[PDB]
Amino acid sequence: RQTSMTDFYHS
Amino acid sequence: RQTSMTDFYHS
Amino acid sequence: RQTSMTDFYHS
Amino acid sequence: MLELRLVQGSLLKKVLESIKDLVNDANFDCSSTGFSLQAMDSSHVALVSLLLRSEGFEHYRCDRNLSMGMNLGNMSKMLKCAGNDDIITIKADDGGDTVTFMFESPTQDKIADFEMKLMDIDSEHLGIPDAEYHSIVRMPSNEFSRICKDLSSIGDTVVISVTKEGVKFSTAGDIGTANIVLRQNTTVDKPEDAIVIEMKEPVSLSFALRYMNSFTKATPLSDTVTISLSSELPVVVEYKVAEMGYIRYYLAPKI
Amino acid sequence: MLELRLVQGSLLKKVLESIKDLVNDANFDCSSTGFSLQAMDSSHVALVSLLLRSEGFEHYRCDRNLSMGMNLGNMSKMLKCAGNDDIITIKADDGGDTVTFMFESPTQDKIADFEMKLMDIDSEHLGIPDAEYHSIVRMPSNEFSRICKDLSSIGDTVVISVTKEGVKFSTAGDIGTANIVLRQNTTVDKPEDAIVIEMKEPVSLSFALRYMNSFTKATPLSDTVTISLSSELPVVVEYKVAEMGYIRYYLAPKI
């Protein structure tokens, strides 16, 4: 499953 | 408007 | 007419 | 007002070529510190962080902090028209809707003026802490580019694993399996042998080759690429922009 | 009979490459003065005038004045088969329906014979008086080629204007505006800086980039291109063929 950048760093 | 060569020189 | 390789050499 | 004069205009051309295929539209942020950008691809799977430090410009005028929203493809089309030896100047009026790119030959016998419309962009920026990665691979950019191209012709996913035995890039697809193992040479005796692998803790992560390959569009910027890995983080792929900045690509893993 | 031996065969190859994409079929007129051609594109918007003087040929036999109607693409396909160092001979029987192109290597170890069918062509030739143009721009052909390619990626029309401040090429399109200003250098210190701008009276005319770009197919013929402009006339774009002739492109303006 391809994770998201947002699953690591938040805005 | 695109002119023609023939509008300048004749045959 | 296109000949075949098999028209010259056999298996 | 904004007026940034970059003597080595080719750097800007290369930078745009490096990011236009990853992100369609993005904001260029100008501050006294430099000309930068941060944007994610449409899937929020990858992120690109660009920084051109103010010290690298010959002339740097940024009265106030500002952001120019732009269509990267259009900006690239215009920059493609600048010669590799041209001095490039980015001009903008703080209360304007257009950006001007001046292309100037060294002798000045030729001066081009390309003007583009700016667009309003509400992009998501992420806070990225300065981490100490478990494994770092510094290798020739051309070799990294070949590895990604080669592996992508075999499969879609590349497993990058670093141990005391080196760094391995692995993929599997319909036609079979393929892996490439790199090790530091006895000495760094030539550019091709300039591979440094720092392993603090072993790391093994899976990534989409399609993204890795897009990152390699920055290859012309540097003879070296640096890959930083950590078990709990996205991989970081960095290319230095001369000695004035960088382009850092971040890619979330497949788990 | 007709027998024209050209030692530098590559010149003929380049000439055909220069005109085949502008005009489909055309007549090559042979006389004691030389091998020539005059034809307009299908829209009568552009005209190409070619002349290879008899003195440039090693052997020149033209018993009577004659015209060979030809499919330029076909002639080009055959000429593409000649080596760049080959001696090329054009042979034809005054009462024949075919033309023969002999390709001969310098050592003669290879001799090719390519024969093509001739066609009847009733083309319109125009009388073009030797005018004294108001502004003339002599510049590197490679630079002119780049300018046209660059501008055409922005818009469809290029406004060429010459004043005492130099020559400006301007275009506007969907992605924005673009202009390039050229000025004579302090000295002609290198090929890239070999730009001469003669301005008797200022001139400003608009032209279709699509045509200008077709003209640049003659770039390999010369390191220099000469652009002649006059307010009441079509622009003339000339490329010298070695020291034995020329290819002159005429393009009617947009008004």
Place this chain on the structure above:
Amino acid sequence: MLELRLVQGSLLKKVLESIKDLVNDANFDCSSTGFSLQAMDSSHVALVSLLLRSEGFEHYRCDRNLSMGMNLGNMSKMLKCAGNDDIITIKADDGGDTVTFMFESPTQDKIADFEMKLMDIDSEHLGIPDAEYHSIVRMPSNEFSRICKDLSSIGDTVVISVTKEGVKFSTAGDIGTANIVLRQNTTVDKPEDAIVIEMKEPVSLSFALRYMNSFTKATPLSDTVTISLSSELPVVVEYKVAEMGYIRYYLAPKI
């Protein structure tokens, strides 16, 4: 087991590029004598005979005679990933269904392992007697490649005829006719002039240019190509693989 170590890995890459577009799937036969292959195209119009002698390998282990059925395109895709200076090793387990290609850089800083599935292939092999051809043409491979490319742009069939006056390649098509006559130079004073024509008895045969052009994919293997002709036999087009073997293409004539 099977373990063949070839120091000049680029040779294998070139060999595969030479045959993949002619035959889709084929068997590679291994014996103490060498690594070979014999296969016909799907139409049984052409045949390719490859031989890499055991002496050319640095390490050669073939316990028993064996045949590896393979998809040539897939093998080529994998080999494309090996560097031109890589040492290539072909490994296989006599009772296995896969083949392994090891790619190793000279310094060993990089070792790749590409594994492919083997397939069962029941291909027809023909017995080819060692004949003494009536005419033999040894010429620069690049020149033969150009001739075939040039002629194929004119027509589909090439008539190759050898007499005491040299060798002529002729074709005719919609746009006209074309022929190229080659003769031995006064001396072999340079590579381009290295053409040897041995004529015992005159020969004239017609062949499909489409096939001839496929044969020229072996051009990078040698600076020379040898064409052997006989009135009652298919033409033989040979390219030497370094000094360790060859690739021989056979093509049945049109009669």
